[PDB]
């Protein structure tokens, strides 16, 4: 009956940020002290909650969203932020209640020559709504002539491969990110801390 946080944080593979992963966590006892007393995270920021008080809290459901971005984009995973990530890949609402946790994953997610498996959406006409996920790969029309699935002039592939190399500057290295959203509805609480 322990919440499967190891499944999320210690997953062998992480999703690309554009195709971000969501794991519904429910009907379990959650020990957030396992995460909070661990000095393995470069980012651990909470909104609407105190990180120490998490063990004495109950929620209807907890969502754990995970993906990979550069270190310099981790700042975009917070309410009220702008940039290619917050705008076209993963958007937190202004009323966000939850925690954002990150750590450098260069030893797992970068390879000599470049890891072209991690991607981000570079092109999108309008910003994503909060918690919206767009996995479309259709050719992006940057002019008046239709693309018709053909890449070329004013016709872009919307996603860009990060191409993580171990020789990248630390802010350009891959970072694994887990976002915990805490949901509180007029329904029974399925996720409580150790009581």
């Amino acid at each position: 009956n322990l919440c499967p946080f190891g499944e999320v944080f210690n997953a062998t593979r992480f999703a690309s940020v554009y195709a971000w992963n969501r794991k519904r966590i429910s009907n379990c006892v959650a020990d957030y002290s396992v995460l909070y007393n661990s000095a393995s995270f470069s980012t651990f920021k909470c909104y609407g909650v105190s990180p120490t008080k998490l063990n004495d809290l109950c929620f209807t459901n907890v969502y754990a969203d995970s993906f990979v971005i550069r270190g310099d984009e981790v700042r975009q995973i917070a309410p009220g932020q702008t940039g290619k990530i917050a705008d076209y890949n993963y958007k937190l609402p202004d009323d966000f209640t939850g925690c954002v946790i990150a750590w450098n994953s260069n030893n797992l997610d970068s390879k000599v020559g470049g890891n072209y498996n991690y991607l981000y959406r570079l092109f999108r006409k309008s910003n994503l709504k909060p918690f919206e996920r767009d996995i479309s790969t259709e050719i992006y029309q940057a002019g008046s002539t239709p693309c018709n699935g053909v890449e070329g002039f004013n016709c872009y592939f919307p996603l860009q491969s990060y191409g993580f190399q171990p020789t990248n500057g630390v802010g350009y290295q891959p970072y694994r990110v887990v976002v915990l959203s805490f949901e509180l509805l007029h329904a029974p609480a399925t996720v409580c801390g150790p009581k």
Partner: antibody
Amino acid sequence: EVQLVESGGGLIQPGGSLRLSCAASGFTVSSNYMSWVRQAPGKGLEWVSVIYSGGTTYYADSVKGRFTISRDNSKNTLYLQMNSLRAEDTAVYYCARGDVSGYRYGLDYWGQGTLVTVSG
Amino acid sequence: DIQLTQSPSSLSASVGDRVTITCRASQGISSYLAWYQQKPGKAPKLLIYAASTLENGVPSRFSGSGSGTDFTLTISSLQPEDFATYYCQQLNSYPGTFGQGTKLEIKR
């Protein structure tokens, strides 16, 4: 045929305001990342500002709080509102299609440039 | 914070020569780099993007190479119209720093 035609440059006193225009043809301004790059006399190039299709804007530290990038989708035009101008803002200002951060394509099409002289 | 060191500042060459212009980034920037050519009184012109992709319309004698910190621009057989200033540009992060420039001038 891609065209980036600029206007708005001229002589202005320090503390004054100027607005630059860049009418485009051959692509849709509002669908692209669009930048302003400037070149002081006898100097190199310096990126100034960018506007995203979704509306996000970024500025180089030296112009932050004084400049405003904007666009008009109906006129297919890019604008640069330059307030509190300083003598060091003296440069030929170019509009260009593209972005400079996580954007491998670079700035493929540039305008002819428009000289802005800030002097007392 | 990325510093771009372009070398040389000046390059003396003759028509038909093979020329190389170097750009060094202070940290690894993968293939986020572009090369431009600029002539006096004219706007810059994109030659190479994504460190090694030749921009459409640009002559095949122009070629880019490198990934990470060390980038080169090669012009395999110099033509009179190639005597101009060349600039590298990092496309990794704001402010998309340009190199100092390389003036390609005529040997005599």
